Structure 1
């Protein structure tokens, strides 16, 4: 079993990794084994003097704080976003662009970005007067919580994977991680995309042909959109993966709608199992959200992401053909 797991982890640099198989083969530790593999591949333990036992201890605790009973927003989703960000960071248009600390920030942010997710939306938490919405004043409720949990877990026994960073490095990493995870709130998507479009229209390339990002605003904007693309990458994956992700998020949505229905609330869009069309919802989500985002990202790194965009377009056509 460990032999098969090691074989599957050789695909960590590939779009379309067998992440559900890895989850089973690893004994439901996909986030731990994928993060460890990526940290070794990028030499991050050596670069930042991270003790291997501290890394594994933190990863296992972080993974435990994802809810195993939530159908979509669980440790498999976290592992998938981590691995997707890792591939996007390796795109030729970004070679030598980001520092090791920025790479660490993007990968760590991906790992923690949905930790302790309860399987219901920000709007549900706001409308039900939840303790989370009360704590966070209705503003990026979940995303603020994911950050607080992800950072708090570093203070548990033998969990501070950043123990050997300088103070300035820790301060910079903390700010970057907060900026990235807060950008995963879907209420920020339209303004995030509008800014990405402006960057593409005005983009500068070095004599090396890579993107020129010479200030914090531009650098953090690219990392925010990168992780947001990874979070919205399911429809760009091979169809057998995309369909499994769709089955999972549909189950999560329908469970929220069942709670809204019981409470006498208006059921959120796409959460009514007695009225939803999953196929029409996929085409609309791709047409209005996922393809506009990925087409813009593909323009930024052109032509590095052409095969990803082609897969997204093929998957849209497939779902459309089922209607």
Structure 2
């Protein structure tokens, strides 16, 4: 109970900022996550022994892939921590509990392949889950780990609070399917503009939490340029591996996944910032003004990709 986690001074300060990078010391990441739960949720939210056991089982069930790995899980949870800490009074006690766990678990057992590749491979997961294939799997893996003896960090919730938190986690993880983002943001854009947006409306909160999940999931584009640029290499390492596997099935991959078309990455990133990233952080900043630093950082990174094309870097 009286056992806090404390970070060194530079991390204690910078962890509060949206653009924080969790660093290359893997052994510090569990402590970073517990620190964020304690400050975001409370030192009482979870039994430390159970939380520590939950965290190490989640880590074990992330694979050694270039991008969709344990570092991504903790990185996405930190972005959620910064959103929750800058929007103190907007979120319920259950939501703060659920959303940090949702972010940590959102890509459990990712193989580094898209929903499309699983469908074209005819992977068993594609027969079990026709849409949001990997995301239904990630939620399945979360429930499985929660049911390991000693791992139920929600044991002290009432039956109804427990069903509510698992429903928050399920919707939050499903919303990380980028196929669902486009329509979620359009509906949120209209509701904000026509003034019908209502945070007491559960289905409205669900939409807002979904956009927060997209914002945390894409948060590579909101870091300092050197972090953004080096994460891109890991992202493209997976895309190109999937491209290779598409060619093995006798299918020409989209340019994004074709390593022969490396040259066109700068312009591909522009399309992505303009079609996905900027609209995401713009709508999020409209609904939650204190998340504006995410939009400002994204615009700075867009400008950096424009500089790459122009040959200035």
Asked if TM exceeds 0.5, the reply is yes
String of CA shifts for 1:67-124, please: whole Å, max 9, x gaps. 12x1010011111110001111223xx4312111011111111111101001000000
Contact 2:76 2:103 in 1 (8 A): yes
1:219 match: 205
Q: Residues 25-36 of structure 1 correspond to what in structure 2 (within 5 A)? A: 25-27=25-27, 30=29, 32-36=30-34
Contact 1:16 1:241 in 2 (8 A): no
Cα distance change of structure 1 residues 288 and 173 upon mapping to structure 2, 3 Å threshold = same
Question: Any unmatched runs of 5+ in structure 2?
Answer: none
1:207 match: none
Q: Residues 1-323 of structure 1 correspond to what in structure 2 (within 5 A)? A: 6-7=8-9, 9-10=11-12, 11-19=14-22, 21=23, 24-27=24-27, 30=29, 32-46=30-44, 48=45, 50-68=46-64, 70-91=65-86, 94-136=87-129, 138-203=130-195, 213-276=199-262, 277-302=264-289, 304-323=290-309
Contact 1:258 1:272 in 2 (8 A): yes
How many corresponding residue pairs? 303
- Pairwise CA distance, 1:319: 0.7
Contact 2:41 2:96 in 1 (8 A): no
Cα distance change of structure 1 residues 104 and 199 upon mapping to structure 2, 3 Å threshold = farther
Contact 1:5 1:26 in 2 (8 A): no
SS at match of 2:188: helix
String of CA shifts for 1:196-253, please: whole Å, max 9, x gaps. 202321447xxxxxx9611211222211111111111211211111112101101111
Contact 2:40 2:85 in 1 (8 A): no
Give the TM-score of the pair, scaled to structure 2.
0.91
Contact 1:4 1:25 in 2 (8 A): no
Structure 1 ranges of 4+ moved more than 4 A: none
Aligned counterparts of 2:198 and 2:245: Cα–Cα separation in 1: 48
Question: Any unmatched runs of 5+ in structure 1?
Answer: 205-210
